Each structure stands twice: as structure tokens, then as C-alpha cells.
């Protein structure tokens, strides 16, 4: 039964779906817990914009870095070898970039981050209520109502309209981004099915072979290290550990401990 | 017992039904959670129309792309081979297009998306209440009542009628689409049973053979890679991993690690 779970774990679509669901849940928890939408007139666009970008950037970097094989790819970087490196890089990038795309999409769909983000950028010259011959209190109240300040002075309905407008735009952006992303994927796949010299079945076989041989060589290296250490003990103490020791014992002296300290 | 589940998984009707149910549930959750029906007079048809089309388009693209064999079909594209490619393409298309059809049908049947979508397109010259010598407030209120604004000024009953009318049309469209879809399927099946050179039993046997040989060759490729890596280790370290290693050990030097770094 657990073998089936591991088999589905090998399915990349399932692991990417798990990543997307986990990122969406984390974003929802973060928004519901620790956002608070600071309401300062001076720099409020900064807070929302940072909330939009920094989590996406750190998730992208984490996805790129958590894959060990990309380090080897870069080391080789720093014919067919170039094509294979490009294919592996694209395949790893896909999973590296799925999560930040999910974060951006869900944030835009929710709309709160964009709502608090570009709120002071709203156009109010159309509305005749906001005269503000001072020209400064207008920006103050504009940044002030979207966060938590109702300020029930007839402006609330206006503010909702403004909010609605921004929210509407947010949704579009999300979907717009989504559209572009999908388009990119398609053309990206085109490259992976146009510049690739290997057959479609050849690529999957080759990847399975690479994973098999990597695991096999790791196991072989561990076993070789184990055998080398076993040999070191059977040459120092004169007996093989884990076997019948009642035959001989070296009884090493003080000078013998220094020899095994070399590695 | 789990073998029976896998056997029913092989049944295409069951997997398509699962896809349809999952899409319907996701659509219901999305509608109940994150729709909100923006109520702006200017561009409200845009929001509903996009909600109708973009999810359908992305689901269609995902269904087309998630099938790996279509990449091979396109690569072959870019006699009997043409007929086989056409048959495989039709069979894969069916499952590729079932989900977006389900989304469109369920959305139209619910009617909310169409309700908020073409609301400002309603005909009001028949109703004598909407004079609006300004000719602009009329469109504003027309877009304003369907979302959440009751505006209890005798117009509510009128608005319900309007809503009803739109809802009625929505239902028809859904069923209309459904009808067309089924008709298409029938004639599509006709082609798959008219242009196909293979017998009805020949096609199923050939497909089973193709799946069996694909899996068999993937397993054989993995095993060949495993054997090649095993041979590499038994030629480098001088022993076969996983067997009795107590016979010989190469003890490779620094120069030996470079040789295995070629692949």
C-alpha cells in the first residue's frame, strides 16, 4: 500500500499539486494572521508591493536552490552535453517556479494585497467630493479608508466603489498572469520537444536511468566506505567486527590510536 | 481488492466521470468563495465573460497538455500512420475537452455567471419605469441591482423579472451547448468508426499492445541503465555491489574519480 503512495509521489503532477495546495494554505494563514494593512499615508504602496514580491522571490529562490542537481548543472556550466543540461534545467525550473506563480495568482485573486497596495494611486479627480484645496488631506484619507477606517462621512460608498475598482483590476491581473504563464509553458514545452535530440521515450528512459545510477552509486559508495572501515578495524584490532571475535585480539597500545586518526 | 480499483481506473468512463465531478465541485467552491460579482457600470460584462471563458480555456489547455503522447503525436506530425495519428488524437481530445465542457455546462446551469455577465445588455425600453432622460443613470442602475444592491424603489420586482429572463436564457444556452456537444460526439464517433481501417476489436487490442510495450520498454530501459551502472562500478571498484565484496577491492586513487564523471 505504501508502495502505491511512493509511486504517486514519483508522479510530478501530484507533487506540484501538493506544493500548490500547501502554498495556498500558507498564504491564506499568513493573510488572516499577520498582514494588518498598515494605513500610513506616506509609504503604504511599499508595504503591499513588498508583500506581493518578496514572498514570491524567496519562494522562487528556495525552489531553485532546494534541487541539488542544479548545483552540478552550474558546476558543469562554470554538443549533446549542452542540450542535456538545457533540458534538465528547464525540467527543474518548472517545479522551481510553480510555487511563486501559485503565490502570485492566489494573492491577486484574493485581492487584499493589491487593495492595500495601490490604494493611494487611485484617481479621484473624477469624483467631485474630493476637492481638498489643501491637496494633502486627500491623499491622507485615500490611504486611510482602505485599511480599517470606515470614516462614515458619505465617503464610504465612494471608497467601496474605489475598492471595487481596484479589486476588479486585481482579478484581471491574476488571470492575465495565469494566461501568460500557461502560454509560456506551452512554448517552453515546444522547445523541450523541438530542440531535444532524444526521442520522447528516450528522455524518460534516460532520466530513470540517471536516477537509478545515482542511487546505485550512492549505495555502492556507502558500502565501499563500510568495507574500508571494516578492513581498517580488522587490520588494527586483528578481528572482523560482528563476527566470532573469540579467536584473537590485538590489544593495541597507546601508539596504535594515532594511526587510525589519519582519516 | 486494490486490483479491482485499478481495473475500474482503466475504465475511461469512470475517470471522465471523476474529472467531471471534481470540476463541478471546484466550480461550486470557486463561485461560493471568490466571485463577488463586481458591480461597476463601465466594464461588468468583461468580468462575467472572462469568468466564463478563461477557466474553460485553461482547463482545455491543461487537458490537452497533461497527456504526454500528444507531444509525440505532434513531433511525428512536425497512409496508415496518418490514420493512426488521427485516431489517437481524437481519443485523447475527448478526455482533453470533457472537463471544459463540464465547466461551461455547470456554470450556465447555475446561471450566476451569465446573470452578472450580460446584465447591462438587458432591454429596458419595453419597461416604462426606466425613462432616464439622462440616459446614463439607467445603465448605472441596470448594472447596479444584479450584484448585491436591492435598492428597494419598486424596481426590485422589475429587476427580478430581468434576472429571471437572463437566467432563463442561461439555462437554454447550457442545454443548447449540451445538445450540440452530444451531437458532435456522435458524428465524431462516426468518423472513428468510418475512417478507421482497423476493426473495432483491432483498435482496442492495438491500444492495449501499445500501452504494454511502452511500459515494458520503460522497465527494460531502467533495467539496462541499472545493469550499465552496475558494470561501471564492477569495472572501477572491481566488485559487484550487493554481492560478496570480501574478495577484492580496487582502492581507487584520485585520478580514478575523473573517469566516472564522463556521463
Amino acid at each position: 500500500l505504501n508502495n502505491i503512495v511512493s509511486s504517486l509521489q514519483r508522479n510530478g503532477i501530484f507533487i506540484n499539486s501538493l506544493i500548490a495546495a500547501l502554498t495556498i494554505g500558507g498564504q491564506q494563514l499568513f493573510s488572516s494572521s499577520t498582514f494588518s494593512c498598515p494605513c500610513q499615508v506616506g509609504k503604504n504602496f511599499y508595504y503591499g508591493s513588498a508583500f506581493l514580491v518578496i514572498p514570491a522571490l524567496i519562494l522562487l529562490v528556495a525552489g531553485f536552490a532546494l534541487r541539488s542537481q542544479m548545483w552540478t548543472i552550474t558546476g558543469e556550466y562554470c554538443p549533446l552535453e549542452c542540450k542535456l543540461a538545457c533540458l534538465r534545467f528547464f525540467s527543474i525550473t518548472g517545479r522551481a517556479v510553480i510555487a511563486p506563480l501559485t503565490w502570485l495568482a492566489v494573492t491577486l485573486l484574493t485581492g487584499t494585497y493589491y487593495e492595500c497596495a495601490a490604494s493611494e494611486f487611485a484617481s479621484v479627480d473624477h469624483y467631485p467630493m474630493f476637492d481638498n484645496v489643501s491637496a494633502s488631506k486627500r491623499e491622507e484619507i485615500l490611504a486611510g479608508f482602505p485599511c480599517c477606517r470606515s470614516a462614515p462621512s458619505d465617503v464610504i460608498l465612494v471608497r467601496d466603489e474605489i475598492a471595487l475598482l481596484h479589486r476588479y483590476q486585481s482579478q484581471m491581473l491574476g488571470w492575465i498572469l495565469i494566461t501568460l504563464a500557461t502560454i509560456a509553458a506551452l512554448v517552453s514545452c515546444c522547445v523541450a520537444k523541438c530542440c531535444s535530440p532524444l526521442t520522447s521515450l528516450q528522455h524518460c528512459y534516460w532520466t530513470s536511468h540517471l536516477q537509478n545510477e545515482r542511487e546505485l552509486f550512492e549505495q555502492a559508495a556507502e558500502q565501499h566506505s563500510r568495507l574500508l572501515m571494516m578492513h581498517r578495524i580488522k587490520k588494527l584490532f586483528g578481528f572482523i567486527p560482528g563476527s566470532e571475535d573469540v579467536k584473537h585480539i590485538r590489544i593495541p597500545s597507546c601508539q596504535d590510536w594515532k594511526d587510525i586518526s589519519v582519516p | 481488492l486494490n486490483n479491482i480499483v485499478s481495473s475500474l481506473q482503466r475504465n475511461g468512463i469512470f475517470i471522465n466521470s471523476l474529472i467531471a465531478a471534481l470540476t463541478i465541485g471546484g466550480q461550486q467552491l470557486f463561485s461560493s468563495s471568490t466571485f463577488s460579482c463586481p458591480c461597476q457600470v463601465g466594464k461588468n460584462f468583461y468580468y462575467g465573460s472572462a469568468f466564463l471563458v478563461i477557466p474553460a480555456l485553461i482547463l482545455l489547455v491543461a487537458g490537452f497538455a497533461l497527456r504526454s503522447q500528444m507531444w509525440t503525436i505532434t513531433g511525428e506530425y512536425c497512409p496508415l500512420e496518418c490514420k493512426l495519428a488521427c485516431l489517437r488524437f481524437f481519443s485523447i481530445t475527448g478526455r482533453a475537452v470533457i472537463a471544459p465542457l463540464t465547466w461551461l455546462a455547470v456554470t450556465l446551469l447555475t446561471g450566476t455567471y451569465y446573470e452578472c455577465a450580460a446584465s447591462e445588455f438587458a432591454s429596458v425600453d419595453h419597461y416604462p419605469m426606466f425613462d432616464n432622460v439622462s440616459a446614463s443613470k439607467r445603465e448605472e442602475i441596470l448594472a447596479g441591482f444584479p450584484c448585491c444592491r436591492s435598492a428597494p424603489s419598486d424596481v426590485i420586482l422589475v429587476r427580478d423579472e430581468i434576472a429571471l429572463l437572463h437566467r432563463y436564457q442561461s439555462q437554454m444556452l447550457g442545454w443548447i451547448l449540451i445538445t450540440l456537444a452530444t451531437i458532435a460526439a456522435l458524428v465524431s464517433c462516426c468518423v472513428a468508426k468510418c475512417c478507421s481501417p482497423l476493426t473495432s476489436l483491432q483498435h482496442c487490442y492495438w491500444t492495449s499492445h501499445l500501452q504494454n510495450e511502452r511500459e515494458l520498454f520503460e522497465q527494460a530501459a531502467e533495467q539496462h541503465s541499472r545493469l550499465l551502472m552496475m558494470h561501471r562500478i564492477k569495472k572501477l571498484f572491481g566488485f559487484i555491489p550487493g554481492s560478496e565484496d570480501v574478495k577484492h577491492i580496487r582502492i581507487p586513487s584520485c585520478q580514478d574519480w575523473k573517469d566516472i564523471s564522463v556521463p
Binding site: - | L165, Q171, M172, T182, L186, T199, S200, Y205, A220, Q223
Partner: protein, 288 residues
Amino acid sequence: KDVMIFNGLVALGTVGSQELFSVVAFHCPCSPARNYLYGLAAIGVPALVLFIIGIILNNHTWNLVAECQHRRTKNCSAAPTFLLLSSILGRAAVAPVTWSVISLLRGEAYVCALSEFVDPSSLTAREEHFPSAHATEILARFPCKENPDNLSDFREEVSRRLRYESQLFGWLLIGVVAILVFLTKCLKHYCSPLSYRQEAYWAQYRANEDQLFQRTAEVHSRVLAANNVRRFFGFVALNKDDEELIANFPVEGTQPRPQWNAITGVYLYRENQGLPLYSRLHKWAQGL
């Protein structure tokens, strides 16, 4: 039997779906000449559609087409056509009928239909009180249950008389299908050339052969693929079960193209010099 349970699940499936449909999404548009079309489509459209998936999913349907395209002469005898046509309908055409009757029985589909046609002067228990211009319009609003309490008296009779018509109409439909099935079964046995024990044995054989055919075909695909793997690698890796098949099932090779065509299509039931042949596949083996 297996056939009855297969039909029973479908009959339960649509009834539950009909119950589900009648709750989430059915709102009669109370607008003149709109509910009438809406009411008719609320019955026929699921009915026509549900009949279609019945035809498509039926394996025997393409068997009829394959022979029809191959023969181009409709040389199939009347009796085998009577078997297949009465087989697809008995397996597929059941679903629309069950949806059609239950929709009539509940009455909410029909009550929208003839609500337009209701005669204002046909009302009783009081003098007719309807304007000559809005009589049709006011009736169209009856099914919505939003009629004023002043018109409630006249609405209940109208909403029930149609509901009377629907249930009576739905019952009458059940009589027709019930009679037809009884009529068809007698015609099937009367016009068949072989007694029902033969028909039972033959139809019982048809299931067993095709069940045997499907299991063998999947195995034959695996063993043929495995042998080609050996030719392309020089070795084959197999589990416990599949490895037994290759050692127990020699590969005959590829059958000739006409041989595959000979085992598809309709059954002529030509007795081999008095010895019966129960399918084309059986004839092919006994023929050679």
C-alpha cells in the same frame, strides 16, 4: 440476473439525479411563451441526450455499423437485426424513459408547459376574473408560487389540474412502454428460428466468448510486446504471473487481415451442414 441489476443501477442513477436536478437548478421562468419552451426543454433535452450516451457506450452499436459499412448491401437478416435493435433499446433507451416518466410524475416540468394554454373561462368555483389582455401573463406567474393571496384560490386549482394531467400522462406512458416490452418479447420469440433454450444458450455463450476474448487479448498483447522486448534487448524482466504466460502461451504471430475482419460484424447463424454456429468467430474456427 446481471442484466436487471445493470438496468436497475441506471434507473436509480437518473432518479437520484432527477431529484438532485429538481432541487439545485430548476426555476420556471414566469414569462409568457418562455416557460412553455423552457418546460419542453426541461424534459426532452435530458431525454434526447441520455438516449445518445446509451447508443455511444453500447459496444454492439458499432458492430452494426461495421457490417453495414462492410457489406454495403444490408444483407443482414431480419432476425439478427431484431436481436440487436431490441438489445440496444433494452439496454440504452431505458434511461430516457425513466427520466421522462419521473419528470412527468413530479409534475413541476409539465406544470410550466400548459400554464400558457389554461383557459381563463374554464375556471370554476367563482366567476372568471381575468383581464382580456393580461390573462395569459398572470397565468404564466402561477408556477413561481409568488402569486398574490387574492389569486391563490384560482392558482391552486390550476396548479393541480395540470399536476393531475402530468401524473395521468406519466402513468399512461408507463402503460405504453410496458405493453411494448410485452409485445416485443412475444414477437422476438415468435419470429426467432430457434427456441428460447437455444436463445438462452446462444446469448449465454456470446457473453462467455467475448469475456474470454477480452482476457486473452490483453494477455496476447503483453506476451507479444514482451517477445519484441527480448528481440530489442536480448533479455526480458518479468514478474511471477507474466513470466508464466510467455512460457505457457506460444506466440502464433500476426493473424491475417481478412481473418480479423471475418470475426467482426453481424452473425448470419448459418448452420454448418446442420451443425449450428453461434457466432462468426465460431464459424472461423470450424471453417478452418
